[PDB]
């Protein structure tokens, strides 16, 4: 217990939350996957839809590498404020929030190779433009667009973790 506490203190001591992993170097690759809990509302009058998900992101930070502890430290969520995280945002979103009951629905897990896992339970009202010219004999294309706000491809790179199996839970959705 003392060893783990001192290791965590050492990792968080002398840490800057203001430089991406490998600041001067190749761009940091962030692997992301989603678990769709439900798709609740699909409003044609507003042309949008509500979607709840377990967003999860993975990156590799050598600054948070520890040795001698053979386990994956799942830290308290508040440590996310003390660590660098991507500035990912949903481009076609109209309103979204992170659930805060019983606490902030957030996840930080530091693997011993520097691999940081960051999780958030997010509800988003994403815009979905619709073509109701054949209504009710219509087939829509709704989309969710995920993008880095400040950084560019020379600094941050995105990829779907697990290929086509990144997004799960779509099969279990029962829309009315």
């Amino acid at each position, epitope marked *: 217990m003392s060893f783990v506490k001192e290791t965590v203190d050492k990792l968080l001591k002398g840490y800057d939350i203001r430089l991406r992993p490998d600041f001067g170097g190749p761009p940091v690759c962030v692997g992301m996957n989603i678990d769709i809990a439900s798709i609740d509302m699909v409003s044609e009058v507003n042309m949008d839809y509500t979607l709840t998900m377990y967003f999860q992101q993975y990156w590799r930070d050598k600054r948070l590498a520890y040795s001698g502890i053979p386990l994956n430290l799942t830290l308290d969520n508040r440590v996310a404020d003390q660590l660098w995280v991507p500035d990912t945002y949903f*481009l*076609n979103d109209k309103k979204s929030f992170v659930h805060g009951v019983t606490v902030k629905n957030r996840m930080i897990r530091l693997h011993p190779d520097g691999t940081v896992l960051y999780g958030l339970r997010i509800t988003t009202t994403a815009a979905c*433009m619709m*073509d109701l010219r054949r209504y009710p004999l219509d087939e829509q*294309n709704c*989309t969710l*667009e995920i993008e880095s706000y400040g950084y560019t491809t020379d600094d941050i790179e995105f990829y779907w973790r697990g290929g086509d199996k990144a997004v799960t839970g779509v099969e279990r959705i029962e829309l009315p």
Partner: nanobody
Amino acid sequence: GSLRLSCAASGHTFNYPIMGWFRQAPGKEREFVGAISWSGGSTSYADSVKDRFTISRDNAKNTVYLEMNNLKPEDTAVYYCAAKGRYSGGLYYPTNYDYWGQGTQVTV
């Protein structure tokens, strides 16, 4: 002197509403010429081809018409027609456009 190109589209046009025109002169890089939205009332032209071009759209027959005016010798080029999806990026760059046309040669 007076020309009227007509780029027609077939398929999932609603997925690719923002339809634009580029031109490539021989030995030159591709350049932006014009763009138009789904409703056909939001035209945007490059400064080098302003006040002598026009773009119109019709959806009953899915087509965009590029109406020309008094030309210049530099206007000779292969004119291409491309489509872009909502939430794709800027208009002036060709990499954001997915589906391109074959390209029609014009010489004046």
